[PDB]
Amino acid sequence: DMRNELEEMQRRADQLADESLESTRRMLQLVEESKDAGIRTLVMLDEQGEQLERIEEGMDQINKDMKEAEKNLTDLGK
Amino acid sequence: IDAICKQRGSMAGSTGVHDTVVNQLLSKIDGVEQLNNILVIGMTNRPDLIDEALLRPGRLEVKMEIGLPDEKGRLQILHIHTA
């Protein structure tokens, strides 16, 4: 009558982490810095676009003025 | 089949293991839920050690004995095995 039976106990392997808290924090800090740099680039790019738009009008005005002056001088000369 | 199903409450119960197996088998063959599409076949050399509740009508109820053959049976077997 040496017929034995058993029961079982369970253990849980550690969840997936303990490497997600050293590279993670550095990743977040770098992401924040990149976000700030992107915001600054946004602002600078908008300012540059405004300045180019401003330049356009003066360019067109000088072109028109020179063309009209040349035509007038030619007309009077002949 | 005599190695699993034996008279309940006679042996040491295999440490309470054999009785549970016999009860489970009895419950599954014929119970509250009805089956009509099964056929169970058992074979043994010690027919006297089997539980009496498993050999009743509604359970394994067709009992047959295979014994030594006579002259005609021996002739038939010899014809079978030298064809």
Swiss-Prot record, chain A:
Ranges for domain t-SNARE coiled-coil homology come to 14-76
Q: Give the region (Interaction with CENPF) as residue ranges.
A: 1-70
MF term (GO), any:
SNAP receptor activity
Q: Biased-composition ranges for Basic and acidic residues?
A: 1-15
- Gene Ontology process terms (BP): associative learning; axonogenesis; calcium ion-regulated exocytosis of neurotransmitter; endosomal transport; exocytosis; locomotory behavior; long-term memory; long-term synaptic potentiation
Keyword set, alphabetical order: Cell membrane, Coiled coil, Cytoplasm, Lipoprotein, Membrane, Palmitate, Phosphoprotein, Repeat, Synapse, Synaptosome
- Post-translational modification note: Palmitoylated. (Microbial infection) Targeted and hydrolyzed by C.botulinum neurotoxin type A (BoNT/A, botA) which hydrolyzes the 197-Gln-|-Arg-198 bond and inhibits neurotransmitter release.
A Gene Ontology cellular component where this protein is annotated is:
membrane
Name its cellular compartments: Cytoplasm, Perinuclear region; Cell membrane; Synapse, Synaptosome; Photoreceptor inner segment
* Family from the record: Belongs to the SNAP-25 family.
Protein's job: t-SNARE involved in the molecular regulation of neurotransmitter release. May play an important role in the synaptic function of specific neuronal systems. Associates with proteins involved in vesicle docking and membrane fusion. Regulates plasma membrane recycling through its interaction with CENPF. Modulates the gating characteristics of the delayed rectifier voltage-dependent potassium channel KCNB1 in pancreatic beta cells.
Task: Outline the subunit composition.
Answer: Part of the SNARE core complex containing SNAP25, VAMP2 and STX1A;this complex constitutes the basic catalytic machinery of the complex neurotransmitter release apparatus. Recruited to the SNARE complex following binding of the SNARE complex component STX1A to STXBP1. This complex binds CPLX1. Found in a complex containing SYT1, SV2B and syntaxin-1. Found in a ternary complex with STX1A and VAMP8. Interacts with HSC70 and with SYT9, forming a complex with DNAJC5. The interaction with SYT9 is inhibited in presence of calcium. Isoform 1 and isoform 2 interact with BLOC1S6. Interacts with CENPF.
What this protein is called in its record is: Synaptosomal-associated protein 25
Swiss-Prot record, chain B:
Q: Where in the cell is it found?
A: Cytoplasm
Source organism superkingdom: Eukaryota
Function of the molecule: Required for vesicle-mediated transport. Catalyzes the fusion of transport vesicles within the Golgi cisternae. Is also required for transport from the endoplasmic reticulum to the Golgi stack. Seems to function as a fusion protein required for the delivery of cargo proteins to all compartments of the Golgi stack independent of vesicle origin. Interaction with AMPAR subunit GRIA2 leads to influence GRIA2 membrane cycling.
Subunit structure of this entry?
Homohexamer. Interacts with GABARAP and GABARAPL2. Interacts with GRIA2. Interacts with PLK2, leading to disrupt the interaction with GRIA2. Interacts with MUSK; may regulate MUSK endocytosis and activity. Interacts with CDK16.
Family indicated by similarity? Belongs to the AAA ATPase family.
Q: What name does this protein carry?
A: Vesicle-fusing ATPase
Q: Which organism is it from?
A: Cricetulus griseus (Chinese hamster)
Primary gene name: NSF
Shown chain mapped onto the complete sequence: 330 to 412 of 744
